[PDB]
Amino acid sequence: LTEEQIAEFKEAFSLFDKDGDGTITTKELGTVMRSLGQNPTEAELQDMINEVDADGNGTIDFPEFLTMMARKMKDTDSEEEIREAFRVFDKDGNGYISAAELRHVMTNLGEKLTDEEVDEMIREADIDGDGQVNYEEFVQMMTA
Numbered sequence: 001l002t003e004e005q006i007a008e009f010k011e012a013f014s015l016f017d018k019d020g021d022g023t024i025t026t027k028e029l030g031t032v033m034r035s036l037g038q039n040p041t042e043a044e045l046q047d048m049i050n051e052v053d054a055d056g057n058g059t060i061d062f063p064e065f066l067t068m069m070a071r072k073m074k075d076t077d078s079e080e081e082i083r084e085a086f087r088v089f090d091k092d093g094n095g096y097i098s099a100a101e102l103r104h105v106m107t108n109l110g111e112k113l114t115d116e117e118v119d120e121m122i123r124e125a126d127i128d129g130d131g132q133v134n135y136e137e138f139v140q141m142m143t144a
């Protein structure tokens with residue numbers, strides 16, 4: 001790990017952990033998933049948590065959250081899950097995620113960000129330098 005990978009991962013954790021109590025619950029997981037256009041059942045939420053629930057307390061703490069990261073880094077999400085994620089961001093469907101589109105998704109996740117901060121995330125993911133994120137750039141981002 002790097003210092004900035006840890007900081008990246010802690011912020012990712014704090015968006016699932018809505019009440020900042022240190023554990024992600026099925027209710028918090030369900031709330032995030034609905035804000036990203038998904039609709040898991042209560043049992044699917046339990047299945048997701050149980051796949052990385054090391055100590056069997058039914059919630060996900062930061063270490064378990066990291067281990068999930070390293071897992072989907074080894075075996076990536078399926079193509080269709082990555083395609084679905086892209087569609088969540090690319091709301092006009094034109095093939096490119098803009099800063100405005102990234103901003104709209106962050107507002108649904110309850111993430112406060114300046115405009116420059118949104119622009120920074122776009123620039124980091126952009127490869128060809130057109131200032132937008134196409135599917136290929138998105139796939140590369142999501143697969144480590």
Ligand SMILES: COc1ccc(S(=O)(=O)N(CCO)c2ccccc2CN(C)C/C=C/c2ccc(Cl)cc2)cc1
Nearest residue numbers: 016024029036038048060077081084085086088105106
């Ligand atoms: C920058 O803004 C964002 C917004 C959302 C995420 S996203 O991580 O929700 N995402 C990653 C795609 O794979 C995602 C993106 C779009 C649509 C749906 C998802 C959820 N996917 C299935 C994985 C959810 C499985 C899962 C299980 C348990 C836990 Cl604890 C956490 C996640 C990331 C960054």
Ligand SMILES: COc1ccc(S(=O)(=O)N(CCO)c2ccccc2CN(C)C/C=C/c2ccc(Cl)cc2)cc1
Nearest residue numbers: 004007008009011012015117120121122124125126141
């Ligand atoms: C390869 O292309 C990429 C890869 C990673 C990201 S990055 O936005 O994660 N990033 C991690 C540095 O800290 C980052 C990178 C460059 C500039 C700004 C950031 C955002 N950071 C400061 C706060 C992180 C807020 C945040 C929210 C939601 C989630 Cl799910 C995760 C993190 C962007 C594009």
Ligand SMILES: COc1ccc(S(=O)(=O)N(CCO)c2ccccc2CN(C)C/C=C\c2ccc(Cl)cc2)cc1
Nearest residue numbers: 008009012072089097102121122125133141142143144
């Ligand atoms: C399967 O379980 C999960 C759970 C959580 C996630 S995760 O996606 O939240 N995640 C953690 C965050 O660090 C992540 C993991 C691996 C690779 C990339 C990310 C998110 N990257 C930092 C870019 C996020 C910023 C960004 C910028 C530019 C654009 Cl255009 C869109 C988004 C994924 C899968």
Ligand SMILES: [Ca+2]
Nearest residue numbers: 017019021023
């Ligand atoms: Ca919590």
Ligand SMILES: [Ca+2]
Nearest residue numbers: 053055057059
């Ligand atoms: Ca646990």
Ligand SMILES: [Ca+2]
Nearest residue numbers: 090094096097
């Ligand atoms: Ca678009």
Ligand SMILES: [Ca+2]
Nearest residue numbers: 126128130132
């Ligand atoms: Ca681009």
